A paper describes a structure:
In [name], the activation of T3SS2 by bile salts is regulated by two transmembrane ToxR-like transcription factors, [name] ([name]) and VtrB (VPA1348). Furthermore, we demonstrate that the periplasmic domains of the transmembrane proteins, [name] and [name], form a functional complex that binds bile salts to activate [name]’s cytoplasmic DNA binding domain, which in turn induces T3SS2 via the downstream transcription factor VtrB.
The asymmetric unit contains one complex with one copy each of the [name] and [name] periplasmic domains. The [name] subunit consists of eight β-strands and a short α-helix. The eight β-strands of [name] form a β-sheet meander that folds into itself to form a β-barrel with a small space between the first and last β-strands (Aβ and Iβ). The β-barrel is lined on the inside by hydrophobic side chains and is covered on one side by the short α-helix (Fα) and an adjacent disordered loop, which could not be modeled in its entirety due to the poor electron density of this region. The Hβ-Iβ loop is particularly rich in aromatic side-chains, promoting us to hypothesize that this loop could be involved in binding the steroid ring structure of bile acids. The incorporation of structural elements from [name] into the β-barrel fold suggests that [name] may not fold properly in isolation and is consistent with our inability to purify the [name] periplasmic domain in the absence of [name].
Author numbering:
A (entry chain B): 31 to 112, 118 to 161
B (entry chain A): 164 to 253
Amino acid sequence: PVHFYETSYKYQAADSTYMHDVAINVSIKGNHFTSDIIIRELVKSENKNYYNVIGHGDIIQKNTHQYYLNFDNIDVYTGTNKYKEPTSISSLINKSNNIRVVYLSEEYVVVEFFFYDGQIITLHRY
Amino acid sequence: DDYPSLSFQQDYVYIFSSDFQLSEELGVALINALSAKEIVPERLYVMLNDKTISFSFISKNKKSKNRVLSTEKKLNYKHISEYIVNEIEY
């Protein structure tokens, strides 16, 4: 059984005008997952750069409310013409990335995950 | 696991943080502010770390609003509360 998750958020640097607009989309078919992330960077309220990041791997449930992801593929697309990264690509393809659930529902789920070395967020189900 | 354990639960407010003092001060401020502006969240999650601050505001319509804030030096209950309340009300 496949469960889809989706959410968006905005990151803001308190010492700068820099910020992210991030849309998250996850697909879980059982033991494996596929994540799709779009990061639009804005400096001074102007669409600066973008990133499309696609993930794939295993989601392993340790406890009833404690998971972790093991990526086997990470794919980054960006603007050809050439900042804060939510997570480093190397830290994903080497470590297990913990996800602790704090509330489960049929319409949404609330988790604490690994972006920015600590982030809480709500994801809608479908 | 290493995420901060829960540290404050009111009507709709949840706060995960290793600073129980800042959690208390922040929760009451949110309750006060949102009631003053007559805003009733279905639920409001918040997470405090050394650098980052994040929260999730679940609306009565079950549509959420998520935010993150990184800061050089730590902020207090009023600064965080004004930030969170400002993002919610938009």
